[PDB]
């Protein structure tokens, strides 16, 4: 499968210089990881993401997932409500925060910008025929 | 006396003078453009009417037009056309 990684960060969905994963076509910024990596002191060798590392750890066997998750929920007896939650967090590649859409839609004058930025009806608009302006009359 | 022949010449000319402010157009090209507009209009209206029939509704709304656009246009044309239609409807009802 001689694939190539995406051209955008898997976490913030933006562009830049990415540390890439070999197994999967994901790519991440350096500060968009957990924990953030120093761009100079980068460990060479085989870098895998959280998801592929979880897969190779469980050897792609989900009967072992049954095993480890049952043992985990047996151990975390103090907070048994947050047991399964506390077990799933370790299978996800990092993300950035974006408000749920049931919160943004309570205020109708509020619109998500291009890169997930705030806009509140005081934004004039981007200039479309000002691409036509670089051409001009 | 012979009747009037409505067409889309003037609106096509307005759109052209918006995109390319200094290029004209021929007359056979304008005929091609009128035929194009009529064909696409008929396609979308027929699909919307079929949709309203299937669901036992008796009204064509912007929802039917939007679904017909999604069914008829390919790929990114659909995304951009839906954006344009939604923006225009929102501006129309805000007034």
């Amino acid at each position: 499968i001689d694939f190539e990684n995406e051209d955008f960060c898997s976490a913030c969905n933006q562009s830049g210089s990415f540390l890439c994963c070999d197994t999967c076509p994901k790519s991440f910024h350096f500060l968009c990881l957990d924990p953030p990596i120093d761009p100079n002191n980068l460990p060479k060798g085989d870098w895998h993401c959280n998801e592929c590392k979880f897969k190779i750890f469980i050897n792609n066997s989900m009967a072992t997932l049954k095993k480890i998750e049952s043992n985990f929920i047996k151990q975390n007896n103090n907070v048994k409500i947050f047991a399964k939650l506390l077990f799933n967090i370790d299978s996800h590649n990092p993300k950035q925060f974006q408000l749920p859409n049931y919160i943004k839609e309570t205020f109708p004058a509020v619109k998500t910008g291009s890169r997930g930025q705030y806009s509140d009806e005081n934004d004039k608009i981007p200039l479309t025929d000002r691409q036509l302006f670089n051409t001009s009359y | 006396k012979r009747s009037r022949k409505e067409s889309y010449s003037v609106y096509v000319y307005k759109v052209l003078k918006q995109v390319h402010p200094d290029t004209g157009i021929s007359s056979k090209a304008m005929g091609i453009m009128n035929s194009f507009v009529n064909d696409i209009f008929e396609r979308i209206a027929g699909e919307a009417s079929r949709l309203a029939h299937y669901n036992k509704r008796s009204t064509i709304t912007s929802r039917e037009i939007q679904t017909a656009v999604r069914l008829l246009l390919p790929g990114e044309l659909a995304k951009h056309a839906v954006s344009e239609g939604t923006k225009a409807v929102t501006k129309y009802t805000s007034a």
Partner: protein, 104 residues
């Protein structure tokens, strides 16, 4: 990991390619108007006698006919290349028309 982020004669086939370019640059009609008009009139006459045609009607027919034949020749050329030839033959026309569904 990655981190990847003695009279002059042209050799047979030259004028063919020159003509191909010349007629793929142009946009005119390639048949003469008068014989095509007579053909259309003969056919329509054996359909329904005492007919009349506007000029634009025969022009539309000529445009549609030529577009049809050009498309058919493109498909025929692909079917000829498929059998490792350069010459188009009637069996290629028959194959293209059968696959398109126009005959069978």
């Amino acid at each position: 990991a990655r981190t990847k982020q003695k009279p002059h004669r042209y050799r047979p086939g030259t004028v063919a390619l020159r003509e191909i370019r010349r007629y793929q640059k142009s946009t005119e009609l390639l048949i003469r108007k008068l014989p095509f008009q007579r053909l259309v009139r003969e056919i329509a006459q054996d359909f329904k006698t005492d007919l009349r045609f506007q000029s634009s009607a025969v022009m539309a027919l000529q445009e549609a006919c030529e577009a049809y034949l050009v498309g058919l020749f493109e498909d025929t050329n692909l079917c000829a290349i498929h059998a490792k030839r350069v010459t188009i033959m009637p069996k290629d026309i028959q194959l293209a028309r059968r696959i398109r569904g126009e005959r069978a």
